[PDB]
Amino acid sequence: INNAVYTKVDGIDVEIFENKTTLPVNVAFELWAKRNIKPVPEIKILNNLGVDIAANTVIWDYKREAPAHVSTIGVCTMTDIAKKPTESACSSLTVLFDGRVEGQVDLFRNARNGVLITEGSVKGLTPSKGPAQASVNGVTLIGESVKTQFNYFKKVDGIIQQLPETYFTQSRDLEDFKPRSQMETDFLELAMDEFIQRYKLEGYAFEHIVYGDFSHGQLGGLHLMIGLAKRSQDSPLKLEDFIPMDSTVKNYFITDAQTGSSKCVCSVIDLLLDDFVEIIKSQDLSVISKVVKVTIDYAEISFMLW
Amino acid sequence: NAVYTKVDGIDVEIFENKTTLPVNVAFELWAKRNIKPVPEIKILNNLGVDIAANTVIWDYKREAPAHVSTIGVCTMTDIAKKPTESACSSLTVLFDGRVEGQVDLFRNARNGVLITEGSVKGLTPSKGPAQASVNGVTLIGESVKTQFNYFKKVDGIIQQLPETYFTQSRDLEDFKPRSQMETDFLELAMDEFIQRYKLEGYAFEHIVYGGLHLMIGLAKRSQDSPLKLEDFIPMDSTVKNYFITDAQCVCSVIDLLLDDFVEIIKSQDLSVISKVVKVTIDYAEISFMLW
Amino acid sequence: NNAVYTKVDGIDVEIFENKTTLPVNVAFELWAKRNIKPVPEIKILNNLGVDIAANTVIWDYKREAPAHVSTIGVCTMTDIAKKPTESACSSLTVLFDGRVEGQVDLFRNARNGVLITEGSVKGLTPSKGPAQASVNGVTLIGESVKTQFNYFKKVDGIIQQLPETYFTQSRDLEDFKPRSQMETDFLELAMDEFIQRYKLEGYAFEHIVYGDFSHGQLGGLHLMIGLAKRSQDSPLKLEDFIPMDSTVKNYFITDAQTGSSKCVCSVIDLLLDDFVEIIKSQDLSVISKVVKVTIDYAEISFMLW
Amino acid sequence: NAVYTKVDGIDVEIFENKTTLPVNVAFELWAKRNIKPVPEIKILNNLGVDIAANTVIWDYKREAPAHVSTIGVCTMTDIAKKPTESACSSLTVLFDGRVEGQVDLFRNARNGVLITEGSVKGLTPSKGPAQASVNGVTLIGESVKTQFNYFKKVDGIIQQLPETYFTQSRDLEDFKPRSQMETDFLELAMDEFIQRYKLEGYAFEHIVYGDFSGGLHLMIGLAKRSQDSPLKLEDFIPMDSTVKNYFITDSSKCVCSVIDLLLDDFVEIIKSQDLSVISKVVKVTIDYAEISFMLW
């Protein structure tokens, strides 16, 4: 009645892995058991970049409990569409290339479509710093020991790309919300007015927004995490992924922590407050439209700021 | 600069304010205000439009000008004498066609929207909404042309505009059906309506009768314990919040034709489980939970 | 069903599941009244003797049940009292939370208990506890709100002195931050650069940190940071063997990459500086190689070299 | 100080390095080494015994003194002349009741442990193992008394003294059974033992019969395994412990924790844990220490 895989640790079956894909069990297990468990970029970034297949490894989506991509390359014979990631079979596919391993750079130099991540500089090519944080075997974190911050490069049809200037979502939760800057600390520490005062924000309608819904169309309000975090000395909130998939704007079930009383299904975006202030101040208030399109996580998000 | 009074010695400049502008130039905007029938602000907002060309668009709901930077309207607020030229082509300019010159300036400017009441050589139109704002009065013209054809450019490129539903713009106070369906819905009880339009075993239930609310459903509930809405925060939003009380919620309401909303309701699976729906309404992508 | 729900939108969302002897409605209430502010972890509480909470409910999120058998003035159907000073309590170590008013007071009157406070208390000397607390069952150290308490104990009338203790950090291996300069360079140096930098030759450090210093406990008994370094290249999935929290914790150890077995066995997570202090403390010229250490207020016995 | 030689002398002192002591004084230790039959080091270690009074306990596997800290033995190494002084305040000191005077010094001592060949005024004995260590050879005394009665003091307070199993202290080569049960376990096939000593549907299976994969094993279990297809093992490190590691070869099996329990004792352990067949965390007392381990 099962598709679970086990190991014996003493006279005890512990379930090492459950199969939640359509693939036959042991085929899936192979796939898993070849996950890159070193630092990878996060699913949101790779979706946003339009990446469909990784070179020579497997990116596992730990929330979805399945591999992040349809096929493979030089990994698992029963789903490999190729062996070297330059075979005719995948010229028309944005291929993740991990520059930390040898010879992947030139594989990418010779690829038609792809993105290359690396720990450092690359000869003749302009980087763009990515997030501070990466994904170490499920857990996303910013790390002291291992380096988690990469530089991205993109190719669309023979040609290197200019990657948009972006902000990055901070991949934080409410359970453990840690301030990442002075402004952020202050905001949580101080009282609204004393804050607006200190950072010079009179007549921006700050209080209105941080706490308010700035959705241009996303499902339920668009609230900002650090803003949800401040409304938590009073009765605080539990979150819960509405859909397993990771993305920049994220749908949740918000319910009271203390008692479960339902609230909404609404979207949160976790941004550095500094980056948030910068965008509220970017808005020109003299024009008709109050939609602000900002590019965050290499993707375009539309806001309603007023 | 500002006009002033001399209230015994001396100059006491007089400011609007509501826009902070000198009454002086504030009023010069009211003057040059567009008086021919214009697109409702919500659709301008959605299409992300910045300034109109050689005019002001008035915000009668805010009782202020929709925009305080101008093109060829008032020297104290003009960012440029003419739309198609220099530090100006980055922002999205609304070009109106039923004034001549303008049409030709759209094909020369970078970012911009264009409305017209007929077709234009070589371009594909997208039918706008029936209604338009007429000096603060939103209405469906039969004496005058209020329905436009829209066209948009970004970075130089003509865009294909999405297939859309448009919101109806009805106030509740004087609500009035616009189809056999909307009629029947208000007449028929719940159960009979679900069986006439073969809707049984779909989602809609809560959203229609009683998160997000449908204006038309809110009107049927008005014949039951008459309710009133007042917007704490008055702009013009495709989805608007209202303070809701009786004749003795803070609600998202959307005004949609049932004939359109039931097209939506049916383009799902036979549920009855709650569904995420992503429609284009008023040129903008709306996500909401249907049940 | 055991399951309690709210309709979020039109969707059944489980907010609570019963895994208790009690009926749903009663357990749910207890859950629903559980203190969700910062609290001492259960290891510290059991180590101390606490068997009941004043006016609150300590919840075990790993065991998904109350931390304690009865209540005081929380829930009419599991209350043994209403006030913590009633004679039905005078034989039980009661947790008194100083951060709320007058609880300090009931603690003076109480004949058996433990009082935590976020600052000094007139007449009594404090035991500066761990840096970390549990906050709605996510154990963390807070810079935002406070997580570090002071402890006091009473045993049948009499004020107590708490032994001086080391405290287990509380760090899963899946996310392991070093908390001192010693831990940083340990992880980021070679063993031999290390032993020298900190002048540790003539202790058989490499033998200890990396090995098994157990006197009895089931499986090996390994330092966490120890495991984290060997983890560096060949990493390990670590998984609770028993829901109950404790100072020395048994685990199912398993390869991360593939699930190959390894063992059941205990880990203890200590600050390296503390560990190094404990090895340096052992007197090498005696028959017994058993070092007893008080950690998290309990006696923990080791085996050294 | 150290003795020395003269090579183009210049005095050249002489050391070890087993202890680091002057050969000189390391030998005084050898000289004063207790040669009456003393309890096995493991039991001393577990009772947390620090040093012995007016004697030296020798560790033959380490080929050295179990302790370098002395009392009343040697000027260079001791910490007190007499076990009662305030230097032995905080140290568990072994006292013997075979040398008189000491039997009484235990009464006016803080922390310490005492052994005797018979009972003592109004103290409850805990009957120790059958075996002592008689000069590097441990055995069960035929004509000499090797069983002890133990008593312990922590902080002037006479202590609890638990009930214990004891390990049998048997090397594998020279292996001899010590009951009908151990006898049959060697004789009877894998399946026959189970029906005879009615223990079908208990845990016990693996740890008694043998693996590739590695947890605890018991001595006799390994003996039956080499009772054909012989197996060789030896101290990886030369300690003395209730549970010791071995290199099994065999060509290797390889690093096992091994425990030498008399079967009947271990069997009464299996039987104290309701019919299951599921793995079982046992927490038992062996050699006066709480050892916990997984039974399957």
CSV table of C-alpha atoms in Angstrom, one decimal, chain A:
chain,number,residue,atom,x,y,z
A,1,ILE,CA,0.0,0.0,0.0
A,2,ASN,CA,3.1,2.2,0.1
A,3,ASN,CA,5.8,4.2,-1.8
A,4,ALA,CA,8.1,5.0,1.1
A,5,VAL,CA,11.8,4.1,1.4
A,6,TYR,CA,13.4,3.0,4.6
A,7,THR,CA,16.6,2.2,6.4
A,8,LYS,CA,17.2,0.1,9.5
A,9,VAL,CA,18.8,1.8,12.5
A,10,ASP,CA,18.8,-1.0,15.0
A,11,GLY,CA,15.6,-3.0,14.8
A,12,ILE,CA,13.8,0.1,13.6
A,13,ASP,CA,12.4,1.2,10.3
A,14,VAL,CA,13.0,4.9,9.9
A,15,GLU,CA,11.5,6.4,6.8
A,16,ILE,CA,14.4,8.1,5.0
A,17,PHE,CA,12.2,9.2,2.1
A,18,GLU,CA,8.6,9.2,0.8
A,19,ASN,CA,7.7,9.4,-2.9
A,20,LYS,CA,5.3,12.2,-3.8
A,21,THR,CA,6.0,12.4,-7.5
A,22,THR,CA,4.4,10.4,-10.4
A,23,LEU,CA,7.8,8.6,-11.1
A,24,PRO,CA,8.2,4.9,-10.0
A,25,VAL,CA,9.4,4.8,-6.4
A,26,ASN,CA,13.1,3.8,-6.7
A,27,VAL,CA,13.6,6.1,-9.8
A,28,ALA,CA,12.4,9.0,-7.6
A,29,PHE,CA,14.7,7.9,-4.8
A,30,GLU,CA,17.6,7.9,-7.1
A,31,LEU,CA,16.7,11.5,-8.0
A,32,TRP,CA,16.5,12.6,-4.4
A,33,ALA,CA,19.6,10.8,-3.4
A,34,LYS,CA,21.5,12.9,-5.9
A,35,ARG,CA,20.1,16.3,-4.8
A,36,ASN,CA,22.8,18.9,-4.6
A,37,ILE,CA,22.9,19.3,-0.8
A,38,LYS,CA,25.5,22.1,-0.9
A,39,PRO,CA,24.3,25.7,-1.1
A,40,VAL,CA,21.9,26.2,-4.0
A,41,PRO,CA,20.0,29.3,-5.1
A,42,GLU,CA,16.4,29.3,-3.9
A,43,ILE,CA,13.5,27.9,-5.9
A,44,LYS,CA,12.0,31.4,-6.3
A,45,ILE,CA,15.1,32.8,-7.9
A,46,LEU,CA,15.5,29.9,-10.3
A,47,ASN,CA,11.8,30.0,-11.3
A,48,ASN,CA,12.1,33.8,-11.8
A,49,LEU,CA,15.2,33.3,-14.0
A,50,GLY,CA,13.3,30.8,-16.2
A,51,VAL,CA,15.6,27.9,-15.4
A,52,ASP,CA,14.2,24.4,-16.4
A,53,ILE,CA,17.0,21.9,-16.0
A,54,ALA,CA,20.2,21.8,-13.9
A,55,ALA,CA,23.6,20.8,-15.3
A,56,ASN,CA,24.8,17.6,-13.9
A,57,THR,CA,22.9,17.7,-10.6
A,58,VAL,CA,19.3,17.6,-9.3
A,59,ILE,CA,17.7,20.6,-7.5
A,60,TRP,CA,15.2,19.2,-5.0
A,61,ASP,CA,12.2,21.3,-4.0
A,62,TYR,CA,11.8,20.3,-0.3
A,63,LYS,CA,8.5,22.1,0.2
A,64,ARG,CA,7.0,20.5,-2.9
A,65,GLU,CA,8.7,17.2,-1.8
A,66,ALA,CA,9.8,16.6,-5.4
A,67,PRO,CA,12.5,17.4,-7.9
A,68,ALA,CA,12.4,21.0,-9.0
A,69,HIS,CA,12.7,20.1,-12.7
A,70,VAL,CA,11.1,17.9,-15.3
A,71,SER,CA,14.2,16.2,-16.8
A,72,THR,CA,17.9,15.8,-16.0
A,73,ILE,CA,21.3,16.0,-17.6
A,74,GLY,CA,24.0,13.4,-17.0
A,75,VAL,CA,22.4,12.3,-13.7
A,76,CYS,CA,19.8,9.5,-13.9
A,77,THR,CA,19.5,7.5,-17.1
A,78,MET,CA,15.7,7.0,-16.9
A,79,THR,CA,15.0,10.8,-17.0
A,80,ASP,CA,18.2,12.2,-18.6
A,81,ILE,CA,17.5,13.9,-21.8
A,82,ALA,CA,21.2,14.3,-22.3
A,83,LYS,CA,24.6,13.6,-20.6
A,84,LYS,CA,26.7,16.7,-21.4
A,85,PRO,CA,24.5,19.9,-21.1
A,86,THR,CA,25.3,21.0,-24.7
A,87,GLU,CA,23.6,18.2,-26.7
A,88,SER,CA,21.2,19.4,-29.4
A,89,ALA,CA,18.4,18.0,-27.0
A,90,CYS,CA,18.7,21.1,-24.7
A,91,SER,CA,19.9,24.0,-26.7
A,92,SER,CA,16.4,25.4,-26.2
A,93,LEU,CA,16.4,25.2,-22.4
A,94,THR,CA,17.7,27.5,-19.7
A,95,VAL,CA,20.2,25.3,-17.9
A,96,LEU,CA,21.5,25.9,-14.4
A,97,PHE,CA,25.3,25.8,-14.3
A,98,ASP,CA,27.2,25.5,-11.0
A,99,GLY,CA,30.5,27.3,-11.5
A,100,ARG,CA,32.0,26.0,-8.2
A,101,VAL,CA,32.7,22.7,-10.0
A,102,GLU,CA,35.3,22.5,-12.7
A,103,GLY,CA,34.6,23.0,-16.4
A,104,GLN,CA,31.0,24.2,-15.9
A,105,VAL,CA,32.0,27.8,-16.9
A,106,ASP,CA,33.1,26.7,-20.3
A,107,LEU,CA,30.0,24.4,-20.6
A,108,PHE,CA,28.0,27.6,-20.1
A,109,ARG,CA,30.3,29.5,-22.5
A,110,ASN,CA,29.3,26.9,-25.1
A,111,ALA,CA,25.6,26.5,-24.1
A,112,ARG,CA,22.8,28.2,-26.1
A,113,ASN,CA,20.6,28.9,-23.1
A,114,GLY,CA,21.5,29.1,-19.4
A,115,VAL,CA,22.4,30.8,-16.1
A,116,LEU,CA,25.7,30.4,-14.4
A,117,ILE,CA,26.1,30.8,-10.7
A,118,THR,CA,29.6,31.2,-9.2
A,119,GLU,CA,31.3,32.1,-5.9
A,120,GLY,CA,33.5,34.9,-7.4
A,121,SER,CA,34.6,36.8,-10.5
A,122,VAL,CA,34.5,35.5,-14.1
A,123,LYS,CA,36.8,36.8,-16.9
A,124,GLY,CA,35.2,39.4,-19.2
A,125,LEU,CA,31.7,39.1,-17.8
A,126,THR,CA,29.7,41.4,-15.6
A,127,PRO,CA,28.3,39.8,-12.4
A,128,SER,CA,25.2,40.7,-10.4
A,129,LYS,CA,25.3,39.9,-6.7
A,130,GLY,CA,22.4,37.7,-5.7
A,131,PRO,CA,20.8,37.2,-2.3
A,132,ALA,CA,22.8,37.0,0.9
A,133,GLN,CA,21.1,33.7,1.5
A,134,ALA,CA,21.0,30.2,-0.3
A,135,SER,CA,19.4,26.8,0.2
A,136,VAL,CA,21.5,24.2,2.1
A,137,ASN,CA,19.5,20.9,1.9
A,138,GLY,CA,16.0,22.2,2.6
A,139,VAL,CA,17.0,24.9,5.1
A,140,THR,CA,17.7,28.4,3.7
A,141,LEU,CA,20.3,30.3,5.5
A,142,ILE,CA,23.1,33.0,5.4
A,143,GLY,CA,26.2,31.2,6.4
A,144,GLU,CA,29.6,31.9,8.0
A,145,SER,CA,31.3,28.6,7.2
A,146,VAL,CA,30.2,28.0,3.7
A,147,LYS,CA,29.7,30.8,1.2
A,148,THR,CA,26.0,31.2,0.2
A,149,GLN,CA,26.1,34.4,-1.8
A,150,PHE,CA,26.5,34.0,-5.6
A,151,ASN,CA,26.9,36.0,-8.8
A,152,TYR,CA,24.5,35.4,-11.6
A,153,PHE,CA,25.0,35.5,-15.4
A,154,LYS,CA,22.4,34.8,-18.1
A,155,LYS,CA,22.3,33.8,-21.8
A,156,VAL,CA,19.1,33.9,-23.9
A,157,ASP,CA,20.1,33.0,-27.4
A,158,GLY,CA,23.8,32.9,-27.8
A,159,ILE,CA,23.9,36.3,-26.0
A,160,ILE,CA,24.9,37.3,-22.5
A,161,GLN,CA,22.2,39.4,-20.8
A,162,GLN,CA,21.9,42.5,-18.6
A,163,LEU,CA,20.3,41.3,-15.5
A,164,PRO,CA,17.9,43.9,-14.0
A,165,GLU,CA,18.9,45.8,-10.9
A,166,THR,CA,16.8,44.1,-8.2
A,167,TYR,CA,16.0,43.9,-4.5
A,168,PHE,CA,15.9,40.5,-2.9
A,169,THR,CA,13.3,39.1,-0.6
A,170,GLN,CA,14.8,38.2,2.7
A,171,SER,CA,13.4,34.6,3.0
A,172,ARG,CA,12.4,35.1,6.7
A,173,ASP,CA,9.6,33.6,8.7
A,174,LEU,CA,7.5,35.0,11.5
A,175,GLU,CA,8.3,32.2,14.0
A,176,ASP,CA,11.9,33.5,14.1
A,177,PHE,CA,11.8,37.0,12.6
A,178,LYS,CA,15.3,38.5,12.9
A,179,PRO,CA,16.0,42.2,12.2
A,180,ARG,CA,18.6,42.5,9.4
A,181,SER,CA,19.4,46.3,9.7
A,182,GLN,CA,19.6,49.3,11.9
A,183,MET,CA,16.4,50.8,10.4
A,184,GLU,CA,14.7,47.4,10.9
A,185,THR,CA,15.8,47.2,14.5
A,186,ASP,CA,14.6,50.7,15.2
A,187,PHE,CA,11.2,50.0,13.5
A,188,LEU,CA,10.5,47.1,15.8
A,189,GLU,CA,12.1,48.8,18.8
A,190,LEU,CA,10.7,52.4,18.5
A,191,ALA,CA,7.1,53.7,18.3
A,192,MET,CA,5.7,54.7,14.9
A,193,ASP,CA,6.0,58.5,15.4
A,194,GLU,CA,9.4,58.5,16.9
A,195,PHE,CA,10.5,56.3,13.9
A,196,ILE,CA,8.9,58.3,11.0
A,197,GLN,CA,10.6,61.2,12.8
A,198,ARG,CA,14.1,59.7,13.0
A,199,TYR,CA,14.2,58.5,9.3
A,200,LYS,CA,12.5,61.6,7.9
A,201,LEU,CA,9.3,60.3,6.5
A,202,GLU,CA,6.7,63.0,7.4
A,203,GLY,CA,3.9,63.0,4.7
A,204,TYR,CA,4.8,59.8,3.0
A,205,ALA,CA,1.8,58.0,4.5
A,206,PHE,CA,4.3,55.5,6.0
A,207,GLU,CA,2.1,54.1,8.8
A,208,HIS,CA,-0.6,53.7,6.2
A,209,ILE,CA,1.4,51.4,3.9
A,210,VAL,CA,3.7,49.2,6.1
A,211,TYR,CA,0.6,48.0,7.9
A,212,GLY,CA,-1.8,48.4,4.9
A,213,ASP,CA,-2.5,46.4,1.8
A,214,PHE,CA,-0.5,47.5,-1.2
A,215,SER,CA,-1.6,44.7,-3.5
A,216,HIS,CA,-2.1,45.4,-7.1
A,217,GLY,CA,-4.2,42.3,-7.6
A,218,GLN,CA,-2.5,39.6,-5.6
A,219,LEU,CA,-4.8,37.2,-3.7
A,220,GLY,CA,-5.8,38.6,-0.3
A,221,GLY,CA,-4.0,41.8,0.7
A,222,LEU,CA,-0.3,42.3,0.0
A,223,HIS,CA,1.2,42.8,3.5
A,224,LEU,CA,4.9,43.2,4.3
A,225,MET,CA,6.5,40.7,6.7
A,226,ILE,CA,8.4,43.1,8.9
A,227,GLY,CA,5.1,45.0,9.2
A,228,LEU,CA,3.3,41.9,10.2
A,229,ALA,CA,6.1,41.2,12.7
A,230,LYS,CA,5.5,44.6,14.5
A,231,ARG,CA,1.8,43.8,15.0
A,232,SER,CA,2.9,40.9,17.2
A,233,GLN,CA,3.3,42.2,20.7
A,234,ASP,CA,-0.6,42.1,20.6
A,235,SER,CA,-2.1,38.8,19.6
A,236,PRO,CA,0.4,37.4,17.0
A,237,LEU,CA,-0.1,35.3,13.9
A,238,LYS,CA,0.6,31.9,12.6
A,239,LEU,CA,1.5,31.5,8.8
A,240,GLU,CA,1.1,28.5,6.6
A,241,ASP,CA,2.0,27.9,2.9
A,242,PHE,CA,-1.2,28.0,0.9
A,243,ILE,CA,0.5,26.2,-2.0
A,244,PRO,CA,3.8,24.3,-1.6
A,245,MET,CA,5.7,26.1,-4.4
A,246,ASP,CA,8.1,28.8,-3.4
A,247,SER,CA,7.7,32.3,-5.0
A,248,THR,CA,8.5,36.0,-4.3
A,249,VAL,CA,5.0,37.0,-3.2
A,250,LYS,CA,3.7,34.1,-1.1
A,251,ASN,CA,0.1,33.1,-0.3
A,252,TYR,CA,-0.6,32.1,3.3
A,253,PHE,CA,-3.2,31.0,5.7
A,254,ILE,CA,-3.1,33.6,8.4
A,255,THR,CA,-4.7,32.5,11.7
A,256,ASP,CA,-4.4,33.7,15.2
A,257,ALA,CA,-1.4,32.0,16.9
A,258,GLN,CA,-2.9,31.8,20.4
A,259,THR,CA,-6.3,30.4,19.4
A,260,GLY,CA,-6.5,29.5,15.6
A,261,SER,CA,-9.2,32.1,14.9
A,262,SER,CA,-9.2,32.4,11.1
A,263,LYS,CA,-8.0,35.6,9.6
A,264,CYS,CA,-7.3,35.7,5.8
A,265,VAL,CA,-5.6,33.9,2.9
A,266,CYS,CA,-3.4,36.8,1.8
A,267,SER,CA,0.0,37.4,0.5
A,268,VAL,CA,3.1,38.5,2.3
A,269,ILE,CA,6.3,39.8,0.8
A,270,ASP,CA,9.4,39.7,3.0
A,271,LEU,CA,11.6,42.7,2.1
A,272,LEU,CA,14.3,44.6,3.9
A,273,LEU,CA,12.6,47.7,5.3
A,274,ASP,CA,15.4,49.8,3.9
A,275,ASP,CA,14.6,48.6,0.4
A,276,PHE,CA,10.9,49.2,1.2
A,277,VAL,CA,11.4,52.8,2.2
A,278,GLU,CA,13.5,53.3,-0.9
A,279,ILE,CA,10.7,52.2,-3.1
A,280,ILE,CA,7.9,54.3,-1.3
A,281,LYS,CA,10.3,57.3,-1.8
A,282,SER,CA,10.9,56.3,-5.5
A,283,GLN,CA,7.2,56.9,-6.3
A,284,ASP,CA,6.4,60.1,-8.1
A,285,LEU,CA,3.2,61.4,-6.5
A,286,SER,CA,2.3,63.9,-9.2
A,287,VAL,CA,1.2,61.4,-11.8
A,288,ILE,CA,-2.1,59.7,-12.3
A,289,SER,CA,-1.1,56.1,-11.7
A,290,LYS,CA,-0.3,54.8,-8.3
A,291,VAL,CA,0.9,51.4,-9.5
A,292,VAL,CA,4.7,51.0,-8.9
A,293,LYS,CA,6.3,48.2,-10.7
A,294,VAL,CA,9.5,47.2,-8.9
A,295,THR,CA,11.8,44.5,-10.0
A,296,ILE,CA,12.6,42.2,-7.0
A,297,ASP,CA,14.2,38.8,-7.2
A,298,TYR,CA,14.8,39.4,-10.9
A,299,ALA,CA,11.0,39.4,-11.3
A,300,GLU,CA,8.6,42.3,-11.8
A,301,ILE,CA,6.2,42.8,-9.0
A,302,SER,CA,3.4,45.4,-9.2
A,303,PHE,CA,2.5,47.5,-6.1
A,304,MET,CA,-0.3,49.9,-5.2
A,305,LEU,CA,1.2,52.6,-3.2
A,306,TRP,CA,-1.0,55.4,-1.9
